[PDB]
């Protein structure tokens, strides 16, 4: 678990903020980018970044591309952050607005070195039927346990055994 590894930061412990949106992968990519950025000084600079802003800045709520989101680099209506989500937790797509408003073995190895990352999948209805435990037949991975991988439903978390769940990740910076 990365929460026990680094308790300083409080980014991992989060959920989504978009009742009717199709940018789940984008929101997960922004959350995973903040988790990988926390490894820099072990969470010393544990701050959030425009997630929803950068997402819009697929067709927003009609497909996704984690890889593209990572290459693009180079909370629910929170006043703390400069830019926040646009979905008052059957919706419209938002435009750009840069105006601060006030190999499973190699995968686990890279996940233990860098940190959490995005995890593309088919996203079937079976997953929704699941509640807790080693569930089986987009989201981001957290860590591993006993063998299965963690993801974030079951109070945010939703672990699965190790439909292209471990298939679709790369890196960049």
């Amino acid at each position: 678990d990365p929460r026990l590894i680094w308790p300083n930061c409080s980014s991992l412990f989060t959920i989504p903020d978009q009742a009717n949106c199709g940018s789940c992968w984008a929101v997960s990519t922004a959350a995973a980018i903040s988790d990988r950025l926390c490894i820099a000084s072990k969470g010393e600079n544990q701050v959030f970044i425009s997630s929803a802003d950068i997402l819009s800045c697929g067709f927003g709520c009609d497909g996704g591309i984690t890889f593209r989101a990572w290459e693009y680099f180079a909370h629910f209506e929170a006043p703390n952050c400069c830019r926040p989500y646009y979905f008052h937790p059957f919706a419209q797509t938002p435009f750009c607005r840069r105006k601060c408003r006030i190999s499973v073995p190699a995968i686990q190895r890279e996940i233990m070195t860098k940190g959490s990352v995005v995890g593309s999948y088919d996203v079937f209805t079976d997953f929704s039927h699941y509640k807790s435990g080693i569930y089986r037949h987009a989201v981001r991975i957290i860590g591993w346990g006993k063998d299965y991988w963690l993801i974030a439903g079951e109070n945010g978390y939703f672990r699965m055994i190790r439909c292209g769940i471990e298939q679709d990740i790369t890196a960049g910076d």
Partner: protein, 542 residues
Amino acid sequence: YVNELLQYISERFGGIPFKGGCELYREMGRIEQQRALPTFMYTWVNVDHKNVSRNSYYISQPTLPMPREFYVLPQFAPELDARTKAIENVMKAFASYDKMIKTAAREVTQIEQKIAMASWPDDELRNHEQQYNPYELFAPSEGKIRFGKYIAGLVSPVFIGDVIVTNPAYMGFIQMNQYPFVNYIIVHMLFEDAEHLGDKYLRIADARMKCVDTITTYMPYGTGYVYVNSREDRDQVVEDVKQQTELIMKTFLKKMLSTLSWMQGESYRRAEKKINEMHRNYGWPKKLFDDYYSILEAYNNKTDKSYTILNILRRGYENRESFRRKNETADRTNFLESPASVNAWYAPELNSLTLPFGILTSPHYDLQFPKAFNFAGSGTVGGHELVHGFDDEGVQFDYDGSLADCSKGKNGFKDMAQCVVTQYNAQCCPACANGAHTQGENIADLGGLQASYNAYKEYIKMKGAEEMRLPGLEKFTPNQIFWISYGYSWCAKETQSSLVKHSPNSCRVNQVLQDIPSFAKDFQCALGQKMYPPAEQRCKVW
């Protein structure tokens, strides 16, 4: 009690010199709720016009900085240059390129025109019956290109609740044209927040006076409560003015069908009743005097001397207060404005007659003064306003607040008004003041005063003793001094620049004095004189 902070505010868009297509409103809504700075909409929010049990939005055209749509008839616009200079901040703000700045100044005008030529000049803005257009984001989305995304600028909302685009004239609308907006908008924001800027630009504009007044329209009830529950015995003046007004309103009712001409039987009975079911309010709200509960009304307003942030905050409140009012239920004891402005008001949207303690005072009034006065002052203004609820505006809203065209009689009414029209139209003050425009308030000039006289008559006759000429001067009459006092209220040396920049006073006195021949007589002076006309003696509209 410089620029950087609000600079970030400005840099919340991008500025003039040298982008994906922004929801100009979102910018607006922000700027409104954060500064109370109306552009692309003045939007006051309250009681529905014609289904009232509720509240609503009145999204509407702005009210232009340059007073009057004067974006049509003479080219007397140097705001061009009250603009360049008052926008020269930048190359003193953060820069070092004028040609831009100029052309863009001309432009922030040229749009302005392209607005005024699409609002409704007041003449058309009588018959609210056609203002009223209930729409909900469903229908605008069908009507236009953003409303929804706007309204977040203004606490679970009532987006669905009946909103009204009073003026469904929105002229429907690019690089060199889009950002002209953001210019204009920012032109404006800074244009009336230069104060917080460095002491330099404030130039382009008494200490306690200006200050307390800013308050006097911002945290209204505060200063009110201070005044009232500070300096006088509420019970006393309130209990007087109760019966005083009541006298007026009464005899005013007596000015009814029985009195009146252009009216008719049932039109009477109704409008009569409109009075009958109509409300008072004096000084304090019904609240304001377990003495905190006012400090509940104005509760939220954080206090921290621990001014830039201050003002901005306080405006944030004044309006935020205005709108937390939105989603609760509609009353009919609305206190429009801060009970220290010396004027009544009567919001025919709902129906109400509130008068401010701040008027329960000098020349408008006093406790132990001759009654000629306490009818010419508090008395007058009482009536002076009350009239409205029979103007060609009052007719619209019923007794209870709705649209049923209360009264045919109309034709009579308008025709008779045309007398008033010409009257003001042929007697110039300066060297004019065309009448057709100000008709309405002009009529009330008469109505109120007419009543307040007829009352004072009645009252004094009931005793028959007050006459008792005045010590400072025997010469005058227990009666004349009435007119003298009324026409003393408006004693106002309007300096002449201000005169050329309601109606102009000297007119109001002279004219509306003509038309009450009762005067012409009771002031001893021969008739055939340029205060009193012959047989068409008086545009007897009351």
